[PDB]
Every structure is written in structure tokens, then in C-alpha cells.
Nucleic acid binder design. Sequence first.
RNA 1: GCUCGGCCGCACGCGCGUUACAAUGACUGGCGCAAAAAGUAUUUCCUGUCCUGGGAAGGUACGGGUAAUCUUAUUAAUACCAGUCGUGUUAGGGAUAGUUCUUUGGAAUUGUGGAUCUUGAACGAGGAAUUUCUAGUAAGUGCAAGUCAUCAGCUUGCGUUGAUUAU
Lengths: 143, 128, 79, 60, 192, 54, 153, 192, 154
Amino acid sequence: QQKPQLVQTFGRKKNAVAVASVRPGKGLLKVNGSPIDMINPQILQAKIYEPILLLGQQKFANLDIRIRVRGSGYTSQVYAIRQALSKGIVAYHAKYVDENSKREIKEQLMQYDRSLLVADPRRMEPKKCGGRGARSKMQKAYR
Amino acid sequence: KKFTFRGKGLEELTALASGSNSEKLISDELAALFDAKTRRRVKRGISEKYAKFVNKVRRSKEKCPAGEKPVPVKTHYRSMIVIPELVGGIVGVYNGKEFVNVEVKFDMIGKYLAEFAMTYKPTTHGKT
Amino acid sequence: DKVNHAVFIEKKNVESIINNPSKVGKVLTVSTVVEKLKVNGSLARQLMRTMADRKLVEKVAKNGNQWVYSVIGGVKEDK
Amino acid sequence: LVITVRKSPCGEGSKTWDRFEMRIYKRIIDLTCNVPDVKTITNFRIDPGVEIELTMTADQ
Amino acid sequence: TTRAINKKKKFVADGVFNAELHSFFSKSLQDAGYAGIEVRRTPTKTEIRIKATKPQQVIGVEGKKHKELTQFLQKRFGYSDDQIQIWAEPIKFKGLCASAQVEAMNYKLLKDVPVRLAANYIIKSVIQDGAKGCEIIISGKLKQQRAKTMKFKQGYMICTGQPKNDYIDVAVRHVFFKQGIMGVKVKIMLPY
Amino acid sequence: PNKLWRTHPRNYGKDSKECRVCGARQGLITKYEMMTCRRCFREQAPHIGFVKYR
Amino acid sequence: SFVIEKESDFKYIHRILNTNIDGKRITPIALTGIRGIGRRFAYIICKVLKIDPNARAGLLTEDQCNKITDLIADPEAHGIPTWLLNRINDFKDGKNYQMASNTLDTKMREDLERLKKIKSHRGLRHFWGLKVRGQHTKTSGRHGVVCGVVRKN
Amino acid sequence: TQPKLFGKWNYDEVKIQDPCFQNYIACTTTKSQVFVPHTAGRYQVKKFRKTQCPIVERLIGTLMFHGRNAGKKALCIKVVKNAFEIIHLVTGRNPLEVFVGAVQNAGPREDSTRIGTAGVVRKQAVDVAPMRRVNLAIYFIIKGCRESAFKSMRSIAETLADEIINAEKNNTQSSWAIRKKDEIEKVAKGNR
Amino acid sequence: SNNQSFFTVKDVAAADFIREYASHLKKANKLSIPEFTQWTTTSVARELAPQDSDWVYIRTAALARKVYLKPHTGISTLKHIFGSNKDRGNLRNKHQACHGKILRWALKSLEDLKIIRKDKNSATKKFSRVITKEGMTELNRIATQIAIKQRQAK
RNA sequence: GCUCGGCCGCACGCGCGUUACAAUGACUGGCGCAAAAAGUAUUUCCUGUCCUGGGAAGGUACGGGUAAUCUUAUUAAUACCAGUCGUGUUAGGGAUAGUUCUUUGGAAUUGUGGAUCUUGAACGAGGAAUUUCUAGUAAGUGCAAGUCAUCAGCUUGCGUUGAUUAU
Ligand SMILES: [Mg+2]
Ligand SMILES: [Mg+2]
Ligand SMILES: [Mg+2]
Ligand SMILES: [Mg+2]
Ligand SMILES: [Mg+2]
Ligand SMILES: [Mg+2]
Ligand SMILES: [Mg+2]
Ligand SMILES: [Mg+2]
Ligand SMILES: [Zn+2]
């Protein structure tokens, strides 16, 4: 079967899931089969470029990384991509490099943001009856 | 003064509706000129009963040539659409308490018979 | 009140307004231009574009309602 | 299966609701065998609420 | 196969079958203490175990009530004679069954035996059979034309929590009098 | 000559159905094809196998 | 365009079909100023008569204006689909006309009159100053509010 | 490489002086230097967490208001960046230095409150905390923005820029934030 | 030089692709542009007929792109992809689907240009449209032209 | 039981609420972002292709699914990108009306819903009063389920975008 040089990490925010696959070579980032350039709301593309700029391109020119994302809505999706990418490099440096590098990129990243290696525990709140929402309730008449 | 429906006269309409070999009460030529809800009621079916009804009008319409007005025909069919062959007759339409006598005019063919007998009384107020 | 904002500019004034964008200010938007030249916003935009094609003016940002442009040599003092 | 039902048989003013659940668990098991072995493996007591469905695809 | 049915729609239908049975048996079996019903379903058969205090009255005089029942289910659903099977199973401890005990006080109250005495008799029985605790509620006109509600507790009792659904056994009955319907609940907390 | 009895179409709408138990037409629960009014359902619910976890 | 060479030729007030037309404005939505013309029809009128829809109303040619009055006169003769008209096939005549400034108020007045005369429910209802479509008079419409046949002023 | 805000604005050029604010305004930290103002942070789970939130994100938060605009963040990120551009076009220095400058420079210090002591009820002269000082600063600035931009042609980016500049300049005419600040501080001085 | 001679549609911002391929369809004058085009708005959900006279081109261009990407995407699904919200007035905004005839015209006419085929071999969705070798080549060369014009900008 | 009305009748008083008063906007394009629910006693239930119609909708041409297999792992809408419109009862806002067309139903008139042209009111942010609410929370935003032949401005749920301020 010839076990590949693959690493596979996942990342999560709300209902969104990102699976990033990392293999060695000339660095690509393709999300859902397309460059980061084309990710829908333009503003938060910089969110995905963040861990890249934080680690420096030097780590990323050595690796082709392809991230498929399926999930909730635009923003959470962006955050999932972020996550998967980040802990993806970490997992690579775990299997194929020394542990030391894994450690120092871990610290490197988390000093900037912890949302990269750790997932946002928040999810939606179910709705309580007698309201238009998960707390707020039908208006009341006292007098 | 004239009386016109979709560019046709009572003579003309009676010429389409009494048109030879059309055994439906309301023939297709006429039904093409109807508003959508009527065309719908016709093409979808109809009941045999209405035939008898129209017949009564036929009998009441020719039975008062001298001009004393027709002998009124009582019926419960509100959902009935007016055929030109009923124009000039007087028909009792049940409003649920009562039989409202309605005299037919050329302008009223397209509409349902119910559209005339008042189902209710209007509102005339007082408290203060 | 109402603000009558001109819906046409005379062929007498046109490139006289165009060639000298600094009458509007250090910052050109729809609003600025509307204020300074009493031109209705759509034509204000059209002016922006014309004098942008003309190398006189540059885009800083575009967000659906917001035009932000600056003058090339800098603000050049009037008359 | 959820059925959300209003408690009071009447309109009695506060609205209260009942979240009524029925869970259905569905399992699949696949075997490579002959008929008698099947009838051997099905030979044991099962609790009442269980539905057991058997299908046989021949294989060469 | 018969018909392909929605696993959801089938299962709900099975539950509704079960409930119809329970209503049928609690209603037509009312003299012998009737507790429960357990239904196994075979492509061949439908097996019903009637769990009861007095199996002897489920059977009757050489299957008078048994044959009656079996045939009732037969005409009702339609069934082959090999397709229906009814067993009666004894409940070894009558003191741990509520529906039974509420049937007991139904009985005792019909014979005009006074409230407190009857309540005590059953409660003492229930605890005699090893139940940790029991309670009885009788509601409705007792004294007079104005409704009363009387509770009788002895032993250990839980109300609230998931343990409620586990340890506590409850049954109600409507009891009929010339004056109207009075009604009776029995809560037996079971032992561990 | 009862011929006219019940001869209005009950084909659909409110009169096509009823609670199997109590024969109510009102607030009938049709959702799993269980044909039980809200009250009757609320009663049978544990016998039908409907738990309240929630 | 913005630039017009002679300020002398621009018509602020234009007049088409017994109605004023606002000049400083975009031509079709300026044409909305007529009873019987809403935005989509005006955009159509611009597409048939090849008039610039991005242009102003002051830039209007009199030729064009007469052509528009003509469009309104015999719209179906100018092309355009029948299904696009305010009046599909009139009760009196089977013809398809589209409703002008005056002609509209006329035909509506006529219709309602024959509805009084007919003594139909809804015609009576109109006469009475009530709601025609059969909605609820218990709650809304209070202290008087516009009933059918709305007139802008 | 040190990230610049929006890529064009260097955080290293912002230095806070007044010792109250240095712990209360985000931008000093590695964690607060962000290309994008959008964290999706948890800033509200504990009492002072709000402090660790980037100031521009805070401002963006305040912007998102009124029923129609609720929960549209992208809009406000746009508005803010644009306003910042107009700011650098007017002043020519880091739109951050202007912002931070104008959060510091406009917000109340003294404020008056009812303190019941036995019989005494009347306004009393009270001093404002750093956190509230900041919060209020932003609240005010943006409220002025809305009131002005409402039916005008001036956009929010514009109104907001105007306000930020006037707010740092201390202008009591042109800055709503300072109008209220001075009004409040005067009410307060009068209530001692 | 390893700067790629070749670029997929997936490497290109979709807006650009659409305006470009529409341009190509005009220059080619390769489209029919039916008569109902003049008097009809996009969807039932819209108050105003489209502001661009070229919409038929643009819409067709984009359509091809969709078919390039999502193969076997039938008309209804496209009516939904190409639909929107519609104000019903004082009733809450609700989802609404596009017109059919325009989309099916665009697919008929794209078969005509050999850029899509009706698959007779899919036994689920039969006669669903899938791009051809030819159409693929064409779109990928537009895409490439675009992407190179982009990396030419420093 | 059957037929026709009635509960929807309007000078008004009082409650829940939907929609707005617009530029943080409306409109015209472009854009491979959800979750959770349902579903055929065989043509009847979800419905995918396909074809016709300008449209709502119709064919019946080829088909799947009693469903983790099929509708679908999609088809949502805020959001984003272009472009129009330019602070005025303006395209904001659409009540109310008149023709036409369609669909559910023996039956639609006292408009069941939906479509096309028209028609365009009040409303320029709301007196005394007063409701609910502390984090994926409020608010906006759509989606399902119940009802149900047809009829959501309701209810019960589902996610998306995401706060100000307390503690
Ligand atoms: Mg809502
Ligand atoms: Mg849109
Ligand atoms: Mg169909
Ligand atoms: Mg569905
Ligand atoms: Mg009507
Ligand atoms: Mg309506
Ligand atoms: Mg339905
Ligand atoms: Mg209700
Ligand atoms: Zn019932």
C-alpha cells in the first residue's frame, strides 16, 4: 500500500470543519481546490495568512497543503481553515521533523493566538419555549 | 345606449351559446371569454343540476310576454355563474335566512350569482 | 429646504473642474465632491472616474457606498 | 422522533411544552456463511422491542 | 415481506398497538390484579405475556376469559389462530405492584370500609412485602359535597429526580360512588 | 330513504380523521401516522414508548 | 454623459400625456410621473423607442415625447406583449389598451359605476367606502384611511 | 515581521502615556497586533476580559448597532478601515495614534450619582474608573457618528473620521464625544 | 521558467472569468439572444428588469462556469442557485427561485457551441449537462489568459 | 344528517405581532457558506433529471427513495464583490385598488394561495406609560416541523452573522 508521507489535521469553529492534508514539496495552499485568494469574504483572508506570516514563509515553501472545508457559514469556515492549517504544520513537524521544532512552533503560534491549536467550545443554544430565542421571552403585561 | 361584453352583444352571445350541437350549458366559445376562475369552474366539470335550473328560467322567461315581469325561480345555487341565457329573469338566491329576488342585467353575466344576494346586513352604529 | 445638485455641467466648465481636483480637498469622496461642487452624487462619481483615468487622482479604497481618492502631486493651492 | 406537546388540556394561561422523544437505534452486521451457520447464530433469546431483518446475497 | 413500512412510522405504530392492548386489558381484565403486558413479535406469531396478580381469573373457568380474550384480539386485528398466543405470568410479589394495590383499595372502598383503616391495611401490606415506603392519595368528595384530598404516607419516599422514574411505581384508579367519581393514587417506592 | 345520510365528502381536512382513542378531531397528532389527540397522546405516551428526557 | 453644451437647452419641466415630467431625474423613473406608468413600463418604453435609460429627462427630444404618447396610444401595435398591460381585455371591448393619465381615472370610474348599477357585493362595498378584498374591518382602517382607488396628490 | 493594522498601519508607533490606560487599552501586546480587527474572541466570559480585546475590534463592536445593523460585522470592519484611511488623508499620521489619542482624550472622569446615606438624597461627586472611561469614550464617539450620519450624505466612515479627529483635538464644538464629556464633567463639578 | 503556462478555472477569481467569457461571446457574436429576453425580468422575485443589456451573455457565461464545476446540475437546482429573497411586503422575506426558460435556452445554445453535452449515460439524471473536452479547453484558456494578466500586475 | 349562511360582519376601546420610516440603505448583476427536521397501505409521500411556458405553473419523457443508500450530504438568508440610484414622500415604504393568468378544492364570489402590468396611502424614529434580556446571549437573518387539499404575519424548533453593558 506504500504508506504516504501524509499528515492530516482537522479544525473547527461552530458547525464548520476543515480537513487539512500536509505533504512535502513546493508550497501550495488550496482550500476546497482553489487558492486562498478566492475565499469568499475578502477581509478575513488575512486571518488565514496569519499563521503563515507568523511562522514565516520558510516553513511553508517546503510543503504542499490542501484544505477541504465544509461547514456552517463564511466566518466560522475561515476559522476552521485557520485551525486545521496551524495544527497541521505542528503534526508534520511531529512525525517527520524533531519534536523540538513541534514544540517551538506550538509556543510560537499560541503566544500569538490560541484559537489556532485549540477549538472554540461555543456552539448554538437551543430555544426555550415562550420566546423568539434561547433566552428572551414573550412580552409580559403586569399592571 | 348599447350593451357590450368583450366586444359582443346579447344577440351575439346568445348566438354562441345557442350555437348548434353544443350540449354543455356553457359552451367553450363563451368560456374562452370568461375570467380565469369561471373558465376554471367550467373546464373542471359542472353539475347536471344547473341544467334544470336554467330550464326553469327558460319557462319563467317566456311565460310572461305581456311584461308583468317573470315568475321568480327559487334556488340555492349561489356558486352558479350567470349564463347570458338568464339575462332578464328574476331568481331567488338564498342568503341563508331568505330568498333574495334578483333581476339580471347584461353587465352581470361573468360573475357568480352569490355576488348579489347579500349574505349579511351592513353595520349601522350607536353607543356614543 | 432642498439642495439642488446640478444634473449636468456646462461644456464651458468641464475640464476646468476636472483638471483641478484640489478644489475638493485632501480627500475626495462622493460626499466631499457633492459638497464642494454642488453636483449630484452620480455625476460626482463620474467625475471621480474621469479624473482618475486621467492620472490626476488615485484610489485608496472602494467599499460599495464609499469612494476614497487622493490627489497625486498632493493638495495644490488654489488660484 | 420528537413530539412537542402543550401540557394543559386547556388554554390555561401559561404555555408549557413536553418534549417527547423516541429513539430508534439501527445496527448492521455482515456475515460470510452458509444457511445452517446463520440459523446457528440466530438461536438465542432476544428482548421484545427488537426487529431483526435478514438478507442473503449469493457470492461466488 | 408484507409492506415496506417507515421504521419511524412502523415503530410508532408498534407503540400504539402496545398502548391499545394495555387499555384493552386494564379495561376488560379489571377484577384480577392486572399489572403489565409484554409483547414479543415473531414473523410467525405474536406473543403476549399478561403480568398479573391473580392469573387464575385471567384464565377463568377452563379458559372462559382466556378464550374470550384470545378471540377478541382475533376479531379485532384479524389474526390466524397460530398467529396469536396469550400467556399469563404471575407477579411473585403483590406488595410491590401498584396497580394491584390500588385495585385492592378500589375493592375495599366499594364495600364501604372506612378510609384510614383501608389505607393502613394496604400500606402495612406493601411494607410487609419489603417495599421501602409507600403513599396513597385519595381525592374527591369524602366527607361532604365539598372536595377533599387526603394523603397517607409511611416509610421512605422520593418524588423528584431520575430516581423517581426508577424506584417509584404509581397507579391511579377512578372509583365510582352514588355521589360521583372519587379517585385514588398509589405510589410504592420499590426497594433496591 | 336515509340515502342522504353522511353524504357530504369527508375526504380531507378536519373530518377525514380522528383520535383512535378518544375520537376527537381537534389538535390531532398525525405526525408519525399515530392519529392521537394531544391529550390522549400525553396519556398514552409512556405506553407508546415516548420518553421525556428533555 | 453629464456635460450638456448649451444650458439653454435642457427642459426642467417636460409635459407628456396631460402630466408634468421632472427633468432633473433619470428618464424612465421620471416617466413614472404619469398615472398608468410604473418603473418597469418606463424602462420598456425606453427599450422600444431606443431612448437612453441612463440619461436625464431634460435631454428629451420632442420627437421622442410624441413617440411615447404614441406608445401609450397603441402599445400592442408597437410590439410589446399583451401580458404587460394595465387593461388586458376590457369588459366592454376585447381590446388591449394600457391606461393613460386621464383614460385610467375614466375607465376605473366607469367600472365602479357599472358595479353600482349591477348591485354586486364589491361595487356596493366601494360605494359604502369599505374594503373590497374581504379583509377584517373589526380592527384596522380606523379613524378613516384610504379605501380603494388611491389618488396621489 | 511586525504586523501592521490593515497592513498599512504600524502599532510600534503607538505609545500610551497616562498610567491609567496602559493596562486598559489593548494595542501594546503581541496578542493585540492584528492585521484584521476580527478576533471572534471570548472577551465577555469574565469581568475584565474585555480589556484584552483589541481596541479597534471594540470600536467595531460599538458600531454594529441598531436593530437593522445588529450582527453585521463585515460592514463595520469596512467602515472602520475606510474612516482610518480618511484619517491618514487628513492628519497624515497613524490613524491608530489618532484613535487611541481620541479614546484617551475624550471620556468622563468626574460623574455624578445618587448615594443614599440615611436621609441624604441628592447628587454626589464621583470619579470614573479607567475601564468605564474607555467604554464611555467609544460609546459617545460612535453615538455622535450615528446622530450626524443619519439622514445626511456623509457616510459613517466620514462621520466617524470627523469625530475621531475632533475627539483627539479636544474640539468642544466639532466633537460630540467632547460635548458630552464636558457637559458631564460640569454637571459633576456643580454637584460637589 | 516554471510560471505555469496553464491555469484551471479553479485558479481564477470567478467575477473576472464571467465578464471575460461574456466579452468573448459578444465578440464572437455566437449567441442568439431570444425575443422574450427584451420584456422579461430575471426572477419572479424582482421588481426591476436588469440594468445591464448584456445580462444574457453574463448569465450564460456564469452558467457555463457552474456546469464546468458542478457537472450534472439540472435546471431546477440552477433556478435555486440563481434565485434570491423576495419582499412579499409586510410578510417576511422568503426564498424564491429563478425563471426556467432563460437557463434552459442558455444550455441548449451551449450544447450548440459544443461546450456542453447532454449525458445519455448517467442513469440517474439523464441528459444532465456536462462540459466537453472542447468546452473545457476553451474555458481553461480564458482562465489562463486572465490569470497571466493577473500575475503580470506587480 | 343534508342545503345555504355565521363565526372574517364595523364609529370605536384594549393585547400579542409582521413591515417600515432608508446611505450601516434600496435596486441590478456576480459569488460552488448551513443546521435541523420530514417523506409513498405503490402513480397518492418527499421529489431528482428532462421538456413546454415570458411567468406562477404545466407535461409526462427517464428515474431514485419507507431511506446514512433517493430528494441531499445539496438550494437558505444576512454577509462579500461590482454597478445603478443621490438625501426629496426619492426606486425609502409599500397599505389600498383594477384588468388579466395559474394552482388546491364538487364548491373559492364575502378577493384560499401564487403570477403580470398598473395603483401607490400612513409612516420623517414615535406622549404618559411600559416589556424582555448577561454570551454564540441580545439583535438581525433565513430554514424546517406542527397545523395542512389549499391557507403562516402564529407556534415549536434549526442553524448563519454576531454585539453594547453589567457581573
Ligand atoms: Mg424570525
Ligand atoms: Mg442581491
Ligand atoms: Mg412537476
Ligand atoms: Mg426538502
Ligand atoms: Mg375577484
Ligand atoms: Mg392578498
Ligand atoms: Mg406541506
Ligand atoms: Mg395557533
Ligand atoms: Zn384523544
